Amino acid sequence: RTRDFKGSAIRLARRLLPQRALTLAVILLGVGGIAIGVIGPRILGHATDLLFNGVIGRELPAGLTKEQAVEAARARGDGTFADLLSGMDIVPGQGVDFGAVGRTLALALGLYLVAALLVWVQARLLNVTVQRTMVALRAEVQEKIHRLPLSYFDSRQRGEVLSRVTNDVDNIQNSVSMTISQLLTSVLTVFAVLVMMLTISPLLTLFTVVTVPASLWVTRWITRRSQPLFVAQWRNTGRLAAHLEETYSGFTIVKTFGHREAAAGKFAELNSETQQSSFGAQFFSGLVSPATMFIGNLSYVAVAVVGGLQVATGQITLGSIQAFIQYVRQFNQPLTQVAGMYNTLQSGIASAERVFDLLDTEEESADSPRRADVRTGRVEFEHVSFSYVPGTPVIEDLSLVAEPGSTVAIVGPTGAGKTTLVNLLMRFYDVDSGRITIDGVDIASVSRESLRASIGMVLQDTWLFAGTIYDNIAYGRPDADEDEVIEAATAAYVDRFVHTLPNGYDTRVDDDGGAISAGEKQLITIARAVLARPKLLVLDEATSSVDTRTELLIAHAMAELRRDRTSFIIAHRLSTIRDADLILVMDSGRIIERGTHEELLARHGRYWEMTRVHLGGIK
Amino acid sequence: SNMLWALLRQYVRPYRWLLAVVAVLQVISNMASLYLPTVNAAIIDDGVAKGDTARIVELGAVMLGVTALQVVCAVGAVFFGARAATGFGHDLRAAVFTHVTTFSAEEAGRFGAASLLTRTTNDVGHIQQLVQLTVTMLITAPIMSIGGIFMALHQDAGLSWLLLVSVPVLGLANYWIIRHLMPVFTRMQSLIDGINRVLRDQLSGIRVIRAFAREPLERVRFAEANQTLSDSALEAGRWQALMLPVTTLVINVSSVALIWFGGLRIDAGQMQVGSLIAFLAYFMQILMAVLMATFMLVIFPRAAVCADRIGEVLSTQTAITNPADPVRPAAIAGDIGVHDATFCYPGADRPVLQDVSFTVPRGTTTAVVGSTGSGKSTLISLICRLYDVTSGSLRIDGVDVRDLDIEQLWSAIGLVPQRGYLFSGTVAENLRYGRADATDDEMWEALRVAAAADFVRAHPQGLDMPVAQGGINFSGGQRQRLAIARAVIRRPAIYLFDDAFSALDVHTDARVRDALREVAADATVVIVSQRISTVIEADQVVVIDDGRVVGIGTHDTLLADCPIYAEFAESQAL
Numbered sequence A: 001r002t003r004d005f006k007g008s009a010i011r012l013a014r015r016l017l018p019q020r021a022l023t024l025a026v027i028l029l030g031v032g033g034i035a036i037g038v039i040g041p042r043i044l045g046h047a048t049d050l051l052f053n054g055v056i057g058r059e060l061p062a063g064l065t066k067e068q069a070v071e072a073a074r075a076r077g078d079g080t081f082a083d084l085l086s087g088m089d090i091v092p093g094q095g096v097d098f099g100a101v102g103r104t105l106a107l108a109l110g111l112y113l114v115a116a117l118l119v120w121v122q123a124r125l126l127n128v129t130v131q132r133t134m135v136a137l138r139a140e141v142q143e144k145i146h147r148l149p150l151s152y153f154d155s156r157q158r159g160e161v162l163s164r165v166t167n168d169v170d171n172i173q174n175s176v177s178m179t180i181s182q183l184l185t186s187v188l189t190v191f192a193v194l195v196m197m198l199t200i201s202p203l204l205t206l207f208t209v210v211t212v213p214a215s216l217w218v219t220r221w222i223t224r225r226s227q228p229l230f231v232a233q234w235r236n237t238g239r240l241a242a243h244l245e246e247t248y249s250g251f252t253i254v255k256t257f258g259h260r261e262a263a264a265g266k267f268a269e270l271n272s273e274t275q276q277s278s279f280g281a282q283f284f285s286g287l288v289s290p291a292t293m294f295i296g297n298l299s300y301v302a303v304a305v306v307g308g309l310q311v312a313t314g315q316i317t318l319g320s321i322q323a324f325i326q327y328v329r330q331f332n333q334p335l336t337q338v339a340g341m342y343n344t345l346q347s348g349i350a351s352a353e354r355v356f357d358l359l360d361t362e363e364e365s366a367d368s369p370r371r372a373d374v375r376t377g378r379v380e381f382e383h384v385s386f387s388y389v390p391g392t393p394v395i396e397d398l399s400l401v402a403e404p405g406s407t408v409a410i411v412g413p414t415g416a417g418k419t420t421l422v423n424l425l426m427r428f429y430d431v432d433s434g435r436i437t438i439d440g441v442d443i444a445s446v447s448r449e450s451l452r453a454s455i456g457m458v459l460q461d462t463w464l465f466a467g468t469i470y471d472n473i474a475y476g477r478p479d480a481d482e483d484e485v486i487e488a489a490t491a492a493y494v495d496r497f498v499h500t501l502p503n504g505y506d507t508r509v510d511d512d513g514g515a516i517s518a519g520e521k522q523l524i525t526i527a528r529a530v531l532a533r534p535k536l537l538v539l540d541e542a543t544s545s546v547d548t549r550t551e552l553l554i555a556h557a558m559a560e561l562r563r564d565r566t567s568f569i570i571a572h573r574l575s576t577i578r579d580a581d582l583i584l585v586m587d588s589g590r591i592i593e594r595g596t597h598e599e600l601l602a603r604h605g606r607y608w609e610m611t612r613v614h615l616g617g618i619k
Numbered sequence B: 001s002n003m004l005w006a007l008l009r010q011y012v013r014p015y016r017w018l019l020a021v022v023a024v025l026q027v028i029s030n031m032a033s034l035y036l037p038t039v040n041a042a043i044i045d046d047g048v049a050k051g052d053t054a055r056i057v058e059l060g061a062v063m064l065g066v067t068a069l070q071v072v073c074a075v076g077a078v079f080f081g082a083r084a085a086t087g088f089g090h091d092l093r094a095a096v097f098t099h100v101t102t103f104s105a106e107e108a109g110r111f112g113a114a115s116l117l118t119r120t121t122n123d124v125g126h127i128q129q130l131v132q133l134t135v136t137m138l139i140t141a142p143i144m145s146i147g148g149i150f151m152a153l154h155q156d157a158g159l160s161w162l163l164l165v166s167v168p169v170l171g172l173a174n175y176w177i178i179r180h181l182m183p184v185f186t187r188m189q190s191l192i193d194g195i196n197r198v199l200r201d202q203l204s205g206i207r208v209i210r211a212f213a214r215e216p217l218e219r220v221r222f223a224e225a226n227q228t229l230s231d232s233a234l235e236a237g238r239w240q241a242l243m244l245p246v247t248t249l250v251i252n253v254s255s256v257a258l259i260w261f262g263g264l265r266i267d268a269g270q271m272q273v274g275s276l277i278a279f280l281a282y283f284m285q286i287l288m289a290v291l292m293a294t295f296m297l298v299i300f301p302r303a304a305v306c307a308d309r310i311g312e313v314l315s316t317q318t319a320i321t322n323p324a325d326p327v328r329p330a331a332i333a334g335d336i337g338v339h340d341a342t343f344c345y346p347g348a349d350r351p352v353l354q355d356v357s358f359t360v361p362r363g364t365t366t367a368v369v370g371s372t373g374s375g376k377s378t379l380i381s382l383i384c385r386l387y388d389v390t391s392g393s394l395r396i397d398g399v400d401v402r403d404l405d406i407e408q409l410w411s412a413i414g415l416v417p418q419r420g421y422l423f424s425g426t427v428a429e430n431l432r433y434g435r436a437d438a439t440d441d442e443m444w445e446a447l448r449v450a451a452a453a454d455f456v457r458a459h460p461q462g463l464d465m466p467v468a469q470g471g472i473n474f475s476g477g478q479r480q481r482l483a484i485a486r487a488v489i490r491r492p493a494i495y496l497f498d499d500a501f502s503a504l505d506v507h508t509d510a511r512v513r514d515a516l517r518e519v520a521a522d523a524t525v526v527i528v529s530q531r532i533s534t535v536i537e538a539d540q541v542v543v544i545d546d547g548r549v550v551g552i553g554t555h556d557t558l559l560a561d562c563p564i565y566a567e568f569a570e571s572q573a574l
């Protein structure tokens, strides 16, 4: 599907026009090469005409007038032959002058050589300019990805933007790099050949160009015929992919219970069905070229027969007919895959307009380089009422206070708005009718990058990028050393299992080792956070997939022991955060109560409810 | 490399019944396409020279007959080639799936689910795409050259030598270009995959990337990746720009030398004028076909890398199999005779599991607890023979598990994995996997046992309610409850629980354990968990750390026997 052809096309062009002189020079070289390549057959036909003249002028008696020879031939009969002689230019009795033939063929070969050289240099220049502009466009895409706010990514499908920035750029490449050369040469060739063949003979031009409406009609009809089968093939391949999904993802559950045979039978049935569907659809799609080839060849037959008839009449020369027989073939050449270029160009148009809409969105609000840093680690919140969309006050009138060096923790039900709070601390989303301060200064007056370089943050889920475990750990501070890396590793207890992996600190994390489960991925992530030596650590469910004992040891190691920094701890298990310098109880925003372990349990709050109810098994 | 050709010559072998017909039809189509300008030229040679417009009109009738034969045989060739390519794709998909089903969990983790699926659904598609293109579009150029030389020989024994010497230099130039260009294309694909991986990793992070403020590093990494891709792009573009001009120049110089040599022989009377028209048409057909095929040829590196991946899948044979005559007790019960069990991946320093040993009587319930990374996760798979031990031995009913019938064992083992997964469909179908022929009341009783009858009854349409892939439509531990019901309908002699109870609350876990004791008292139960409350009531408990046992006994004895479990006790106490 497409929604803007002209606008996206002109934007794609204006992505290339900045070359200006280079672009116009490339266009000039291309058009000159096409024109001279069209001209070449004309001089070849002229040379063939000279040869044919010198051949059939031998049998006539020498010294006669051309009109006299025509009359002598016509008197004995040979009416068509007499017409041929009348319409053709021979002095009777004279042979071929090889000097003129040599001159003409030398001119032809020279112009062909310069045509090839110009075509090559034009191709090299177009490749250089398209690759340069393409690198610039991809760099702009990357820069925008660096500048975009988080709400843009969070408000769409997970694979949507990924396909828009990865696959659509490749489509842009495989579309424009092809078209701007081949389609441009095709259109220049068709214009040049049509004007030359119009200067040759008009009836021949009609007998040729009748194929264009026929070609477009037949390709449109074949496309409309194949579209239902193409959609069916798409649907059936989607069904096959989905079935492969649930038989591969739950492969252990398939090997257990012994259901390999049933899954194999279902797969075989749907695979055969998709085989038939793909067979039909692909046959109907691939039969486009033979049909237009036959239409062009029927046009060629008409050209040949009418050219023979007209040569017998004498209205035209043989060499012009030879040039025309060449020209009809070079005219047929583009139409064989003009539909292919059209569909590829339309796909590139759609991808280009999508990419441009991505590149024209709002960016971050030009963070002022205030460059504020923390000294003690005091935090403060003032009546923030943030919402993803107006009408859903997920955060509402919180006034939490934490002294520097405190390990204040928060408890609440899943989905109540914890991650929203930690994002607001990160300036991932702006504040709404609230004030937040670090060490007594508002963050909104502080540059975002300087803040984020000093916080230290881990999410509910882990993130890992292609590379070794050592690379993932060192991502926290690249200019550190392996001694520091292993020190942080021992601090985060990843060492207890990293040696169990095939090669410690060297396993490709994108290549799952099987033994690398979610909890130890969380350990890797928290180790990465540790290496950066943060002063405002926040633990947002970073220990969900790990045992409680490991959580208590690591917490006592790097938060309770590290009295020099304050910390936020978020966990769904109360015993994991018991005795952690006052605890907050938040229930879908609307922070309820605050206090230390004993004081908060003694006041019979919701914290007391959850501690009493869950441990006692009461429901 | 040559992996693509090996896979082809192995798997398209049953389709020589069809590809030969495709080739024959392509040959006859191109021979007709070259017979077309031959009689076109004959029109000038005879009809024009004699002036007989009749000869022209019947030669036009023959013209139409030839082109009709060409189109019908060409469309037949395309039809049969499409059939052959689709059959090849179907056979490749079936073979890949059948071979990969023999894998264990080890190989599945080695390859990865998403990578495996994309390999088996898109790489095979690319391979069949290339097969159809080469059997319907690419082979035109070689057949075109062969037909051109053959028809030049047919026309005369003279001027044909110039065509016979002009075509091979074209072919050599094409081969020279492609030999250099192909490695550039494979490096192109490698860099494209790398940059796509970089983009995917960056977008997946975003939050963490902005948090650590590693913008300076990410920017330069993307810049260097794109610059390397640009260098490869320029390298490929050089040869691509060389491609068309050399072919065009070769055809043009062949044509000019053609006219130059033909004129001399025609002057002597050895050659006729129409042969020039025929030869020019032959060379232009050659140019069109060669350009078209070489332009389509850019698909080759895609098929090369796809074949490399498919060979990666197919070459790795499974290391787990029945030993061609295992024992069939058919009445196995709970023994689990772990004895000095050891397990370790190759190249690792510390083993996954080592020198552990424990046994359970026929109907007792045991559990294992410990810190994450201790290797307890793989112990369940070792019991169920998803992984084979390195040097240890664990026996069921006195005979080591590797000597058992693995199908019978899986029949007698009820397992809930740590990755609670459900197949797309309905509960009344996913739950069938425990028995495949269960009854509705049995399913409802299982939901009662799994402490899950409440919400499944709450659904308006009944227990036969739809589920998405992986149970993602559910809230969480509901999936674990469904897995428990699936396991319990089977009535297995041995129960395997792998941290499934962690996703549940204390009271629901207690109810589930009480139901299991009520129903499966005769059978044995093995539980993996990180929660003490789920393990307290077990008959015996074993605690493992760093892949070895650190404590065995009961909860009452172990709470004071070893400080290692006292760590868990203090961590869970309030």
Ligand SMILES: Nc1ncnc2c1ncn2[C@@H]1O[C@H](COP(=O)(O)OP(=O)(O)O)[C@@H](O)[C@H]1O
Pocket: A154, A155, A388, A394, A412, A413, A414, A415, A416, A417, A418, A419, A420, A421
């Ligand atoms: N991208 C988003 N767009 C709209 N609403 C969202 C988005 N992300 C989260 N929410 C809503 O905001 C709430 C956030 O809760 P969350 O911070 O995840 O709590 P917790 O961290 O305890 O799980 C959720 O209930 C969800 O419905």
